[PDB]
Design a protein around this nucleic acid. Structure first.
Length: 109
RNA sequence: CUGCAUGGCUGUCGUCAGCUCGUGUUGUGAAAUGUUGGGUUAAGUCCCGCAACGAGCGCAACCCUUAUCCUUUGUUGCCAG
């Protein structure tokens, strides 16, 4: 009884063997994805993302493509969402305990 | 006597831009990345960039001298009124 959102077929190869488990087959050489290996995982994805937000968890979005470079910057006044829209800084997550000096250099503004 | 057994004290490349630490990444490791590259500089200097982000020392400056205007003043130097 489950159904796909918008999918009917998407891309050729352009390959990674690790993605084969999600791919049900092909339609005129273009690949089609398996409902049972994508839909339950996508249902969980929006459930767990909301659970982290209910636990006051800090959310980061990446919008590094032009039609998203401004939409990524806000999730309405009733919300809290961090962003990257164009460019990165090396170690800004794993070396954040040093890049906090770079953040202070901008908080100084 | 022995500074090729030593503390202290003093040269030279050179006043050349170079020597390191914390963190994150890499490699089995030595170590690299950083500190290389690009434009630029007196220069690891100043901009740019990239898995590197920052910091410490040297480097510029702080020490010494001299060049000018403006204002007030002075011995045994000066002399416009």
């Amino acid at each position: 009884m489950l159904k796909a959102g918008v999918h009917f077929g998407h891309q050729t190869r352009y390959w990674n063997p690790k993605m084969k488990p999600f791919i049900f087959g092909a339609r005129n050489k273009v690949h089609i994805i398996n409902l049972e290996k994508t839909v339950p995982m996508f249902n969980e994805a929006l459930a767990e993302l909301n659970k982290i937000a209910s636990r006051k968890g800090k959310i980061l979005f990446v919008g590094t493509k032009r039609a998203a470079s401004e939409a990524v910057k806000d999730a309405a006044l009733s919300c809290d969402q961090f962003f990257v829209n164009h460019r990165w800084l090396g170690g800004m997550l794993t070396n954040w305990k040093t890049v906090r000096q770079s953040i202070k250099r901008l908080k100084d503004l």
